[PDB]
RNA sequence: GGAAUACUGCCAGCUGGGACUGAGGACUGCGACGUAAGUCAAGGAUGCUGGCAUAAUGGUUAUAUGCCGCCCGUCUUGAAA
RNA sequence: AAGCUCGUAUCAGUUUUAUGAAAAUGAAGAGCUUUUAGUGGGCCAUUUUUGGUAAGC
RNA sequence: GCCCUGAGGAUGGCGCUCAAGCGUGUUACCUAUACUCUACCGUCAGGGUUGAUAUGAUGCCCUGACGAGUAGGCAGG
């Protein structure tokens, strides 16, 4: 069910983008909701805040 | 490698102002993130729109119509340096707009020491007919039946020792 | 690749040639440098002459002899240039330097043996066309070298009878090529041609 | 044995490692001419006949050609060449792991070598210069690049 | 070979076929050298032995011819 | 007959080292005829033997051999890292070494 | 008018070359193949081969050499000094 | 360091929100008596300054 | 934009000029006690253990993280 849901969601997104392109109206892309953050600097000389 | 992108923003439409001016411009960048950042910077500078109330309607990549056709490109560039900002115009004989803008950026970083941070691409246009080019170094390649040699070729050596005394003839 | 490599220093850059020779020495390769006087250095002659003076002007006060040593021979200059590129004052560096020999011209028996060149160190391959350059022999003569006349005199003799040796080799190769041609079109020759030979 | 363990020794846990048959490389095919790299017969061109159950290759000189008898050679210490010689006419099923056991040359071994040589000599002579090529040893020369040479 | 300035792919191919530059290229010693190098790189050990035997025979024949 | 070589001669440059620290456990070996890492990839896993003459005779011979293996490529000039059972004396810098074709895959 | 290719991202797609690790110690569990019996790459390696008692191999001293390492303790001054 | 009550709603070198008092992230190692060694040297450096003229100070 | 003037020593030296100098962009590679996986010592925390253990329950084991440091404190030798 989850695989089918993902496939349907991606197909719907692509179809909506294509329809918006064809209709000449701008597409309202969904706002991002998940982000992955990775530390880059070390554990020293970092300001307290 | 540079790429051409199109970005449009309409400052988060609010009540009584639906569908604002919808500022449109073409931005050359190596990736979508850099294109969006440059679009935001241009909006902040030239216009009064900032990312606080801004919105990216859509970002698209534009491919050159004829990637295998030689063209003469006229570029109007406004760049900032140690001195005050000033306008600049240059002519480039390239095949694609992306290559022309890349060569312009390389020349600016080489001659004027201006880098991508303080360079603005106002407009890129194609020169259709001859005698419209205003730069001699571009007219140089427009001469009919242009033939020239390549004296003193820098041949590459794959081994430290060569028992031939190579000649640079071409 | 070769137990000993003879490098023709004529028309070569001192810096690149010395660097490559030192690198090969550190790899355990024996190299012999010839025609040092013909070595070339980039830049106009006056700049090279001025550069030489400022390194010998530092003569030590208390002990000049035990201090800097100023050598005029082109081979000595090349060795000094290459010496700094090697980790001297150490056993590894000292052993490597033993594998290098520098001579003016081509003294025997090297005169009768094949010699090679370094493409990356050629003056006519690296320097931009039309740029000024300096000759090591002329600089050495200006700074005190007194053997340029004899070096040229006995190098001219080196070309003498070596032109004759090459003429004899050409005559022999004429007959060799004739024998190869008359031996062509045979079954063995046809098979060799088919097999890439 | 009847003797109970006189000291406490922990038994081994049930191991799970099946003895799958060797997955020989494609280049190694019966009848292919092989080149020995290490051993008493290093650098001696030999022929490939059969794959033994002990993950070793049964190779014959043949003995009458270069003196190499029926021997067991590891695959990893052999170079496989594109050249091949017919082997369907040579009987090799008799040889096995127990055949090479060592419990003044065994008479049966000599007879088997003679039979193999007789069977394979016709196939070797089927192509010109094949016997001479097998007899000649293999060695490297200046300018030879194994990573560039084709075998 | 002659070629109009800024010719397209079709015209370039047509002119290439008409000029028959390929035939001239093969006849030149440069293309022959390339082909010989490729063939040598494609040689096999048995082919190398055959080449050695043929070279020995050719050398014997040449030496017999020489000094006569 | 003329030649019995079945190995590719090489040179031992130096141990894997930084600007001021060296790791003798890893040795850098230069292989003749190798100029790029792709070419050196074929030599990975090949046995490396260093042959030298010893003053004393121990096993009826005056030659003592130290064995090793090729681990991975090093740099862009074809240099390949190698690890031996016992590290090299560090006096062999530039010494000739032998690389065999076994274990072979071709 | 029509496909192909470049680029991006996916493959619970396939398959070679190289290096280190073999940790646990009779079964208890999650799993796969198989109608079943049974098998398996499934909570950590097994089988075979070659060297050995005037052994295999290992240990100590200096020299042979790739690199690094300021002379120790207390006390001044925020430190070195 | 020992004791009691305990794991929470005891909190934050964080953010938003609210008023001009409600949520996000993380930690449940948090709360109250007794005493028990040592600790009141300062340097570097941004901003205020204490104000200014060759400068510092 | 670059160059010159414009006021016992060292880009470290060797040295270099389509640079091995300068500016920019892309790949190729080296490493620290830095980071990923695994072998081992110890500390902490949790857990299993007896109609007795196929080794002193102060025993025998499983799980996760951690390990810099002057005076001082605690613990084991």
Curated annotation (Swiss-Prot), chain A:
Question: Any extra detail in the entry?
Answer: Present with 101000 molecules/cell in log phase SD medium.
Localisation: Cytoplasm
Kindly provide the name given to this protein in its UniProt entry. Answer: Large ribosomal subunit protein uL30A
Q: Which residues form a coiled coil?
A: none
The family this protein is said to belong to: Belongs to the universal ribosomal protein uL30 family.
Q: How does it assemble?
A: Component of the large ribosomal subunit (LSU). Mature yeast ribosomes consist of a small (40S) and a large (60S) subunit. The 40S small subunit contains 1 molecule of ribosomal RNA (18S rRNA) and 33 different proteins (encoded by 57 genes). The large 60S subunit contains 3 rRNA molecules (25S, 5.8S and 5S rRNA) and 46 different proteins (encoded by 81 genes).
Give the residues of the full protein shown.
50 to 98 of 244
What role does it play? Component of the ribosome, a large ribonucleoprotein complex responsible for the synthesis of proteins in the cell. The small ribosomal subunit (SSU) binds messenger RNAs (mRNAs) and translates the encoded message by selecting cognate aminoacyl-transfer RNA (tRNA) molecules. The large subunit (LSU) contains the ribosomal catalytic site termed the peptidyl transferase center (PTC), which catalyzes the formation of peptide bonds, thereby polymerizing the amino acids delivered by tRNAs into a polypeptide chain.
UniProtKB/Swiss-Prot annotation, chain B:
Keyword Transcription regulation appears in the UniProt entry: no
User: What are its GO cellular component terms?
Assistant: cytosol; cytosolic large ribosomal subunit
What is the taxonomic lineage of the source species? Eukaryota, Fungi, Dikarya, Ascomycota, Saccharomycotina
Q: What is this protein called?
A: Large ribosomal subunit protein eL20A
Q: What other facts are recorded? A: Present with 54300 molecules/cell in log phase SD medium. There are 2 genes for eL20 in yeast.
Ubl conjugation: present as a keyword of the record?
yes
Position of the Glycyl lysine isopeptide (Lys-Gly) (interchain with G-Cter in ubiquitin) cross-link: 123, 129, 147
Q: Which Gene3D superfamilies match?
A: 3.10.20.10
Keywords assigned by UniProt? Cytoplasm, Isopeptide bond, Phosphoprotein, Ribonucleoprotein, Ribosomal protein, Ubl conjugation
Record localization: Cytoplasm
* Superkingdom as given in the UniProt entry: Eukaryota
Into which family does the record put it? Belongs to the eukaryotic ribosomal protein eL20 family.
Instruction: List every position bearing Phosphoserine.
Output: 30
What the entry lists under InterPro entries is as follows: Ribosomal_eL20, Ribosomal_eL20_dom, Ribosomal_eL20_eukaryotes
Curated annotation (Swiss-Prot), chain C:
Task: Keywords in alphabetical order, please.
Answer: Acetylation, Cytoplasm, Isopeptide bond, Ribonucleoprotein, Ribosomal protein, Ubl conjugation
Its subcellular locations are: Cytoplasm
Explain the post-translational modification: N-terminally acetylated by acetyltransferase NatA.
GO biological process assignments: cytoplasmic translation; maturation of LSU-rRNA; negative regulation of translation
- Subunit relationships: Component of the large ribosomal subunit (LSU). Mature yeast ribosomes consist of a small (40S) and a large (60S) subunit. The 40S small subunit contains 1 molecule of ribosomal RNA (18S rRNA) and 33 different proteins (encoded by 57 genes). The large 60S subunit contains 3 rRNA molecules (25S, 5.8S and 5S rRNA) and 46 different proteins (encoded by 81 genes).
Q: What else is known?
A: Present with 43300 molecules/cell in log phase SD medium.
Q: What is this protein called?
A: Large ribosomal subunit protein uL13A
From Swiss-Prot, chain E:
Additional record remark: Present with 45300 molecules/cell in log phase SD medium. There are 2 genes for eL14 in yeast.
Residue window of the full protein shown: 70 to 137 of 138
PTM text:
N-terminally acetylated by acetyltransferase NatA.
Cellular compartments annotated? Cytoplasm
The role this protein plays is: Component of the ribosome, a large ribonucleoprotein complex responsible for the synthesis of proteins in the cell. The small ribosomal subunit (SSU) binds messenger RNAs (mRNAs) and translates the encoded message by selecting cognate aminoacyl-transfer RNA (tRNA) molecules. The large subunit (LSU) contains the ribosomal catalytic site termed the peptidyl transferase center (PTC), which catalyzes the formation of peptide bonds, thereby polymerizing the amino acids delivered by tRNAs into a polypeptide chain.
Q: Which family does it belong to?
A: Belongs to the eukaryotic ribosomal protein eL14 family.
**Can you list the disulfide-bonded cysteine pairs?**
none
List the protein's name. Large ribosomal subunit protein eL14A
The annotated subunit structure for this chain is:
Component of the large ribosomal subunit (LSU). Mature yeast ribosomes consist of a small (40S) and a large (60S) subunit. The 40S small subunit contains 1 molecule of ribosomal RNA (18S rRNA) and 33 different proteins (encoded by 57 genes). The large 60S subunit contains 3 rRNA molecules (25S, 5.8S and 5S rRNA) and 46 different proteins (encoded by 81 genes).
